Amino acid sequence: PGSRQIQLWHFILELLRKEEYQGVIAWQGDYGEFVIKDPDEVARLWGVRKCKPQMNYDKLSRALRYYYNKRILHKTKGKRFTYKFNFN
DNA sequence: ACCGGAAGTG
DNA sequence: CACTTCCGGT
């Protein structure tokens, strides 16, 4: 059709614009910054969505680190599980 | 917890 | 490609 596979940063935003996932992941601090409150839950869902049952935060976080070079994401240093989108 | 290299997947 | 898997560092 024109369908690519579901990107992880698509999937993070999908969750982050839904109040029914605030317990798991939410916006915090500055503009574009977010926090994972339940790292193991996020990964489980990202495993469910990609039919990859052995997914976990170690593997998911690697995925996120590959976004640093690509200028989609980066880390907020000091704050745990706190990344921030590159909207500039 | 967080990093990044390296090989593997489809 | 866009991750997944694995794992040796700080």
SS element count, helices: 3
Count of DSSP strands: 4
- Strand order within the widest beta sheet: 1-2-4-3
Number of domains: 1
Q: State the helicity in percent bands.
A: 25-40%
Proportion of beta-strand residues: 15-25%
Radius of gyration, CA atoms, in whole angstroms? 13 Å
Task: Kindly name the structural category.
Answer: alpha+beta
Shape: globular
- Main β-sheet, in a few words? 4 strands, antiparallel
The separation of the N and C termini measures 31 Å
Order of helices and strands: HEEHHEE
Protein name: ETS domain-containing transcription factor ERF
Modified residues (Phosphoserine): 3
DNA-binding region: 6-86
Subcellular location: Nucleus
Main attributes?
ETS domain-containing transcription factor ERF; 88 residues; four-stranded antiparallel beta sheet
Protein architecture, described:
There is one protein chain. The chain is α+β, with helices and mostly antiparallel strands. It is 39% helix and 16% strand. It has three helices and four strands. Strands 1-2-4-3 form a four-stranded antiparallel β-sheet. It binds a DNA duplex (10 and 10 nucleotides) through residues 4-5, 7-8, 50, 52, 54-55, 58-63, 65-66, 68, 75, 80-81. The PDB classes it as dna binding protein/dna. The entry lists the keywords Transcription, Tumor suppressor, ETS family, repressor, DNA binding protein, DNA BINDING PROTEIN-DNA complex. The assembly is trimeric. The entry is titled "Crystal structure of the DNA binding domain of human transcription factor ERF in the reduced form, in complex with double-stranded DNA ACCGGAAGTG".
